[PDB]
């Protein structure tokens, strides 16, 4: 019955309320902020102090964290020059990156280069998602009417709202079925 | 020209190679295959 109800729970697919749209925006913003904090914690664990935190002491430096900082700076410059880049890394791109690193006397294993590239790619898409959320915070006029020449396509908000309502329906069904059957089963077991 | 094109579906297949045409043809073929399989299942259930 739970499987059938979960499959059938595909009723609502769009938001027609400004208040519901704002609530979905706030929930998505909270989730993205949590993800950003997790990514920042992972980056700090991988590298350590960064920017003001690193330069506050001005006398504490480590070669391992210096290599990570140089790789991060190189990837940031690459994104500034080329905003759009495929997730995968080709052989020539890896060779060019390694040659650029070794030009100043830095040798980095390809696995660490790939990991840093993946982390930087994730951070860039997190920033892009944050910018998209900022745009969609005012883009409700475009979203509601769906203009032909729309300058903004807000779909993540709708998807997250659909996920939230489906989860709420599933939780309500689970609670109901529990109260119907499992409470009585537990009472019978306790009595026995 | 229109009559010649209509009376020759091979020419339509050769020319209409757009993404929409191919997707519609694939969807129609999948629907026909599923309908045939449903008919087979119904016939098997009725016979047994």
């Amino acid at each position: 019955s739970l499987r059938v109800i979960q499959h059938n729970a595909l009723e609502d697919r769009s938001i027609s309320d400004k208040q519901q749209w704002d609530a979905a925006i706030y929930f998505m913003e909270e989730a993205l902020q949590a993800r950003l904090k997790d990514t920042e914690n992972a980056i700090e664990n991988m590298v350590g102090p960064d920017w003001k935190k690193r330069w506050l002491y001005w006398k504490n430096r480590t070669q391992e964290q210096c290599v990570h900082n140089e790789t991060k700076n190189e990837l940031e410059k690459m994104l500034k020059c080329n905003e759009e880049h495929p997730a995968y890394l080709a052989s020539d791109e890896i060779t060019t990156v390694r040659k650029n690193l070794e030009s100043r006397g830095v040798e980095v294993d390809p696995s660490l280069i790939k990991d840093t590239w993946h982390q930087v790619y994730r951070r860039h898409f997190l920033k892009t998602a944050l910018n998209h959320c900022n745009l969609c915070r005012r883009g409700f006029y475009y979203y509601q009417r769906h203009f032909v020449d729309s300058e903004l396509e807000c779909n993540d908000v709708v998807l997250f709202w659909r996920i939230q309502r489906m989860l709420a329906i599933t939780a309500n069904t689970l609670r109901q079925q529990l109260t119907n059957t499992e409470v009585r089963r537990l009472e019978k077991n306790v009595k026995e | 020209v229109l009559e010649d094109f209509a009376e020759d579906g091979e020419k339509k297949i050769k020319l209409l190679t757009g993404k929409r045409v191919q997707l519609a043809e694939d969807l129609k073929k999948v629907r026909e295959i599923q309908e045939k399989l449903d008919a087979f299942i119904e016939a098997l259930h009725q016979e047994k």
């Binding site: - | 045409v21 519609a24 129609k28 629907r31 045939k36 399989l37 087979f40 098997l44 016979e47």
Partner: protein, 362 residues
């Protein structure tokens, strides 16, 4: 009945596309052998009729051939798109069937190519046959012919891999008396692809020819008992399909095989199991396994195809939110209507503007 409808479904799946996307869902028993390995005689003996034309070295079979074993009112053969019942008894009918098969093979193969992706569907009916579908494929070659397409071997390998992509595809390996078990490319490929061999059953053909070639009886005993093949097959049976020549009738070969089974030089040595004789038990086991695997496959596909259709519909709707299904007929009708509207608009233009434009241009 069920077998005819299953064959029709397989034919529809094959005609769905020239590639292999949904054709690998339902199980398909495919018979793959070696070039000039005598597999033609074994295939003819399976159908109890000479229907495959013989080839003196040349690869006559260049397109996939579907053989559907069933039982009908008469022991005749009928194609999917044909109405003439090719009898499997009269010599003239057999010759006509072979000529039709050759014509179909030539039509599929392009004028200049060697291997054609088009398949040939044939249904065999008659008493004494089982209920299964057999697929015939060209033998695996090693050398490359300079006078043909250099990628013929690659195409054959790709076709074989696509056919073997089916997890429930039963492979019937056919060898020769002069060809050892390790010398069979098909057997080695099956062992490499299926080390366990829980669904592949080895069948030994032309035992008398191998025995007459001063072979070691210990190797034959080990092969029959299954002490040499690493795969754990469900069983091993040794049969004789004649000398492989083109001058022995089906009845004569059957009588010779029966005589050899009744009186064999290896059965009298008490070195072979008594329950590993004949083919009735093996055929029944193969039929039961094929039926259960095809039932499981169709049970899974009853939901798999629905999910695929739903996903395709969702993709079409998402890619074209403001456009519905546009097939060849509707698009052609819309183009015709647009052409008619353009012609109407052209005819409705004021003649004065035409006169002014023509005068100015001239």
């Amino acid at each position: 009945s069920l077998i005819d409808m299953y064959s029709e479904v397989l034919d529809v799946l094959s005609d769905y596309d020239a590639s292999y996307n949904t054709q690998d869902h339902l199980p398909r028993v495919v018979v793959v052998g070696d070039q000039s390995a005598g597999k033609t005689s074994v295939l003819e003996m399976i159908a109890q009729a000479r229907i495959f034309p013989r080839g003196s070295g040349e690869m006559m079979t260049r397109s996939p051939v579907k053989v559907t074993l069933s039982e009908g009112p008469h022991h005749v053969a009928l194609f999917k798109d044909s109405s003439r019942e090719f009898d499997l008894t009269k010599e003239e009918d057999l010759a006509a069937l072979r000529h039709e098969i050759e014509l179909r093979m030539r039509k599929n193969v392009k004028e200049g190519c060697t291997v054609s992706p088009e398949t040939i569907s044939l249904n065999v009916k008659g008493p004494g046959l089982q209920r299964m579908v057999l697929v015939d494929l060209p033998g695996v070659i090693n050398t490359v012919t300079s006078g043909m397409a250099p990628d013929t071997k690659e195409t054959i390998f790709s076709i074989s891999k696509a056919y073997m992509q089916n997890p429930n595809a039963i492979i019937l390996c056919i060898q020769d008396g002069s060809v050892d078990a390790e010398r069979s490319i098909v057997t080695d490929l099956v062992s490499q692809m299926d080390p366990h061999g829980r669904r592949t059953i080895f069948v030994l053909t032309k035992v008398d020819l191998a025995e007459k070639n001063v072979a070691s009886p210990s190797r034959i005993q080990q092969i029959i008992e299954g002490k040499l093949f690493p795969m754990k097959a469900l069983g091993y049976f040794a049969v004789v399909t004649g000398k492989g020549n083109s001058s022995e009738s089906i009845e004569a070969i059957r009588e010779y095989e029966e005589e050899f089974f009744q009186n064999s030089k290896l059965l009298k040595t008490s070195m072979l199991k008594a329950h590993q004789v004949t083919t009735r038990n093996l055929s029944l086991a193969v039929s039961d396994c094929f039926w259960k695997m095809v039932r499981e496959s169709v049970e899974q596909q009853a939901d798999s195809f629905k999910a695929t259709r739903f996903n395709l519909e969702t993709e079409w709707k998402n890619n074209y939110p403001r456009l519905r299904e546009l097939d060849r007929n509707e698009l052609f009708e819309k183009a015709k209507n647009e052409i008619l509207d353009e012609v109407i608009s052209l005819s409705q233009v004021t003649p004065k503007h035409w006169e002014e434009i023509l005068q100015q241009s001239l």
